[PDB]
Design a protein around this nucleic acid. Structure first.
Ligand code: MG
Lengths: 129, 55, 70, 318
RNA sequence: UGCGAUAACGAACGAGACCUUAACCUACUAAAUAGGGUUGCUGGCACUUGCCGGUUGACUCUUCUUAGAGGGACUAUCGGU
């Protein structure tokens, strides 16, 4: 049962939060970085932490994760959100014709506004569920 | 620290454990072996032109 | 005796390789290594296993004495 | 670009770890001494027969950790490695023996650089220091350069007639490349260009140009004799190594994806080098950590993570 | 033990970490209270130069020895699941 302990995991997470850059995939370097950074009394523990960090990095390299979304990750997300692949056109314009609204909908429109583009559907209630 | 105490009725057994703080221990390690305190990182400004500064 | 023999064998295996590394082509050494791997009865790799401590409550390490609740 | 299209000819396999550095001798062309993560250091010699472009001549078993950066002397009889066990080892390449074990660093020795006269060694470590050694085993000058790790230190060759001072540049994880001089025995200029962290600072065969690269994925070239700013390339992924060739104003650069190749002044991002691997999934594909051009400007050597020295060669289209 | 799902959030003890020992070090520091190499004298051989020895006679070494300081494994790299 090589389940890396909770404390270790936490430490790794913290490290990731702090220093996402200066954590290059490979292991020895990572370990060294960890040593430089945090005050691990043990050696074995430190090694474990390093390993965990490496694993996390690897995971990241195949897309993001839960509990690991610190700064750089946010920026990456954020940019995408800002400049979405969509939208060409409006979108959600009156691209094809002038809105296939229902009879009821049309009535509502009439009640409310004056002159709108409409295409009045038949409203088939339809049999069965 | 264990210490028996003789009284009229019988004996009372006193035991005392005092967990000294790691910082004021001096001999041996100054911190617990499981605790991993991570130092806070330091900020830097990227780019600001290629530039040089000669002597 | 057997253990001693094994040790001797291991030493022999090492020695030639070492010599090759030192004073002969590396290719030869590599070949030797490959050969050893192919017929690996340890030889270059030192054997990992040392005996277990015979902890109390038992005549061997893992083995215990003999309970009875009769 | 014009004519040459580089072709993978040979593949050298004598290691069991990352081939973290290679170095052809300045005088002698046939040699290629390759340093690795698996503690060994292997001297290859160019045969030029079938797939076996080179075959191993001598292994230098004498370190308790990684062998990071190797240098060959000008003549090509001695070589100095820089290991992760806080030392360097001056070898006798032809003999198959050590000579000088350099003690002093309090951190894994990342880079080494010998003078063109094969006299004054200088080395940098994960120690916030660069130490200067002789061809014996003795610490002369000690440079308190940076506040973070010093990743690379490489001496620039000079021709225009004898000032006295020899010049090198020290890459770091402080985001500062820093040039030096050694007979003022001190600083030349700070090249504060990088955004992320630097891995490599490679001076060219010319000497006046110095390509710096790292995690940023942007290769900043620097003018050294003029002591001024110059070009800045974008290379997408993290750069592990750089290499100038004598043949042209080529800048080879080992990215995380593969090996990109540019022309220096006429900035065009020309060729990419990527060999094949068995199986694998997505964003892993064994990358070139180090690489080295020969003295001809013909045979490109590439140290990979997959324990192979991959050998590319010039081949004209027409 | 974690990952997850979650009127629960972050914690402590216990487990883990820890310690001792068992494993690796032709990389360091060391030794006639640990072991070898050359050589002196010297025993026997074949009798060419070579083979085994015995002597704390010299000189030098640290691989095995010990045992100090360190590294070294983190499930590492790759494949699936
Ligand atoms: Mg896997």
């Amino acid at each position: 049962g090589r389940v890396r302990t909770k404390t270790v995991k936490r430490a790794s997470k913290a490290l990731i939060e702090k220093y996402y850059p200066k954590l290059t995939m490979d292991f020895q370097t990572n370990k060294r970085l960890c040593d430089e950074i945090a005050t691990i009394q043990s050696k074995r523990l430190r090694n474990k932490i390093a390993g965990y960090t490496t694993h996390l990095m690897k995971r990241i390299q195949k897309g993001p994760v839960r509990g690991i979304s610190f700064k750089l990750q946010e920026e990456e997300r954020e940019r995408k959100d800002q400049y979405v692949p969509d939208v060409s056109a409006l979108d959600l314009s009156h691209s094809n014709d002038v809105l296939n609204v229902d009879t009821q909908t049309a009535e509502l429109v009439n009640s409310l506004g004056l002159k709108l583009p409409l295409s009045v559907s038949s409203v088939s209630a339809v049999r069965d569920r | 620290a264990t210490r028996h105490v003789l009284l009229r009725q019988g004996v009372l057994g006193i035991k005392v454990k005092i967990m000294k703080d790691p910082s004021r221990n001096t001999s041996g390690p100054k911190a617990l072996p499981d605790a991993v305190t991570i130092i806070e990182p330091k900020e830097e400004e990227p780019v600001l032109e290629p530039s040089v500064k000669d002597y | 005796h057997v253990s001693q023999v094994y040790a001797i064998r291991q030493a022999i295996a090492k020695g030639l390789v070492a010599y090759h590394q030192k004073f002969v082509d590396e290719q030869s050494k590599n070949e030797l290594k490959k050969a050893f791997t192919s017929y690996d009865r340890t030889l270059l790799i030192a054997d990992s296993r040392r005996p277990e401590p015979k902890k109390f409550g038992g005549r061997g390490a893992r083995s215990r004495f003999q309970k009875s609740y009769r | 670009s014009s004519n040459i299209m580089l072709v993978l000819r040979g593949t050298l396999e004598g290691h069991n770890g990352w081939v973290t550095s290679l170095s052809t001798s300045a005088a002698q062309p046939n040699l290629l001494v390759s340093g690795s993560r698996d503690k060994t250091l292997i001297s290859w010699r160019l045969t030029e027969n079938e797939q076996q472009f080179g075959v191993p001549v001598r292994s230098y078993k004498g370190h308790s950790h990684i062998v990071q950066d190797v240098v060959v002397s000008a003549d090509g009889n001695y070589a100095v490695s820089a290991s992760w066990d806080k030392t360097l080892r001056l070898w006798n390449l032809a003999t198959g023996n050590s000579e000088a074990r350099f003690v002093g660093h309090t951190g894994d020795v990342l880079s080494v650089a010998i003078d063109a006269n094969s006299s004054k060694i200088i080395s940098a470590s994960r120690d916030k220091t660069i130490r200067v050694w002789n061809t014996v085993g003795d610490c002369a000058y000690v440079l308190l350069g940076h506040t973070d790790w010093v990743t690379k230190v490489r001496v620039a060759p000079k021709n225009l007639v004898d000032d006295g001072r020899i010049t090198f540049v020290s890459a770091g994880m402080d985001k500062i490349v820093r040039s030096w001089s050694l007979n003022s025995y001190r600083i030349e200029a700070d090249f504060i260009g990088h955004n992320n962290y630097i891995n490599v600072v490679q001076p060219s065969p010319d000497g006046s140009l110095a390509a710096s690269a790292g995690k940023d994925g942007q290769i900043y070239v620097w003018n050294l004799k003029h002591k001024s700013a110059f070009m800045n390339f974008d290379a997408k992924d993290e750069v592990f190594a750089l290499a100038f060739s004598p043949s042209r104003f080529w800048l080879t650069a080992a990215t995380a994806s593969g090996i990109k190749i540019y022309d220096l002044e006429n900035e065009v991002l020309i060729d990419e080098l990527k060999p094949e691997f068995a199986g694998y999934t997505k964003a892993q594909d064994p990358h070139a950590v180090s690489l080295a051009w020969s003295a001809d400007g013909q045979t490109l050597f590439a140290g990979y993570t997959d324990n192979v020295i991959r050998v590319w060669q010039v081949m004209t289209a027409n």
